[PDB]
């Protein structure tokens, strides 16, 4: 999509938190 | 930087970065990735510039990981290696969750 177009990148879960 | 980050601790395979497949290689102080068909790594990010990291869970047609930088940029890694992509995602994640906080410093 706009900006990121690798394919599908939305349900991307974080884990490092707000550093 | 340019001392110990020249050694690869984690080797990942069939990883697409920006609609391009290749192999990922995590080094002591930096995460590098080489695109298939190339002899050089087009991806080289220092753990110190990485703010956080995302991992794309099951349900998608692919397993993914992404380097969220404090620079306001994100480096997405599409794990296309059906064989170990999930575990690879996890190991890259694990090593980064291990490595990242040891080189970076919170913006708060």
UniProtKB/Swiss-Prot annotation, chain B:
It is found in: Nucleus. (Microbial infection) Upon Rift valley fever virus infection, interacts with NSs leading to ubiquitination by the NSs-FBXO3 E3 ligase and proteasome-dependent degradation. Coiled coil: none annotated. Belongs to the TFB1 family. Component of the general transcription and DNA repair factor IIH (TFIIH) core complex, which is involved in general and transcription-coupled nucleotide excision repair (NER) of damaged DNA and, when complexed to CAK, in RNA transcription by RNA polymerase II. In NER, TFIIH acts by opening DNA around the lesion to allow the excision of the damaged oligonucleotide and its replacement by a new DNA fragment. In transcription, TFIIH has an essential role in transcription initiation. Component of the 7-subunit TFIIH core complex composed of XPB/ERCC3, XPD/ERCC2, GTF2H1, GTF2H2, GTF2H3, GTF2H4 and GTF2H5, which is active in NER. The core complex associates with the 3-subunit CDK-activating kinase (CAK) module composed of CCNH/cyclin H, CDK7 and MNAT1 to form the 10-subunit holoenzyme (holo-TFIIH) active in transcription. Interacts with PUF60. This is General transcription factor IIH subunit 1. It comes from Homo sapiens.
